[PDB]
């Protein structure tokens, strides 16, 4: 289920974070508007970039904590406020987060593994609602 998936991702976080983030960027190429240092590079080139590895790790480290702190896939208000008020998230709207989780759930559904895809869909939709409530457009 959802709690076990959190442990699965944490067990190999580097690989999942990189693979899921790449699925996001390849499914929604226009999202590189936000990460212009990743333009013009293949997956293998991104995976050898220090900055890419560090960013994906810290994103998914934090995403797994937000997931771990949720109840029934509903994230804490404090966690959403953190995400809205991060300096690095200044320009973003909820549609950006929706697309990350669409790609994440698609990655799980295409995986050989028994991820609780439906739970992560709910988590994504509940996080977006939480971010709206904390002020994200």
88 is in an annotated binding site: yes
Q: Which of 4, 15, 26, 34 binds ligand HEM (CB under 6 A)?
A: 34
Sign of CA dihedral 61, 122, 38, 136: negative
Q: Shortest gap between Cβ of 28 and a second copy (angstroms)? A: 26
Which range touches ligand HEM (CB under 6 A), out of 15-23, 40-48, 56-64, 113-121? Answer: 56-64
Sign of CA dihedral 84, 85, 87, 90: positive
Q: Would you tell me which residues interact with a second copy (CB under 8 A)?
A: 7, 10-14, 53-54, 57-58, 61-62, 64-65
Q: What is the DSSP letter of 34?
A: G
Q: Which of 88, 111, 114, 118 binds ligand HEM (CB under 6 A)?
A: 88
Judged by DSSP in three states, 21 sits in helix
| Contact between residue 94 and residue 135 where contact means Cβ atoms under 8 Å apart | no
Least Cα distance to 75 among 17, 130, 134 occurs for 130
* Binding-site entries for heme b: 36-37, 51, 55, 58, 88-89, 97
**Using CB under 6 A as the criterion, which residues of the chain lie in contact with ligand HEM when the complex forms?**
31, 34-35, 54-55, 58-59, 62-63, 66, 83, 88-89, 92, 96-97, 100
């Amino acid at each position: 289920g959802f709690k076990q998936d959190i442990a699965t991702i944490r067990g190999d976080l580097r690989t999942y974070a990189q693979d899921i983030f790449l699925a996001f960027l390849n499914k929604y190429p226009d999202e590189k508007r936000n990460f212009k240092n990743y333009v013009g590079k293949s997956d293998q080139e991104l995976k050898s970039m220090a900055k890419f590895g560090d960013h994906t790790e810290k994103v998914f480290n934090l995403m797994m904590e937000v997931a771990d702190r949720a109840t029934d896939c509903v994230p804490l208000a404090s966690d959403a406020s953190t995400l809205v008020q991060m300096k690095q998230h200044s320009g973003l709207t909820t549609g950006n987060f929706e697309k990350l989780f669409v790609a994440l759930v698609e990655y799980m559904r295409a995986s050989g593994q028994s991820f609780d895809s439906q739970s992560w869909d709910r988590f994504g939709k509940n996080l977006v609602s939480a971010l709206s409530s904390a002020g994200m457009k």
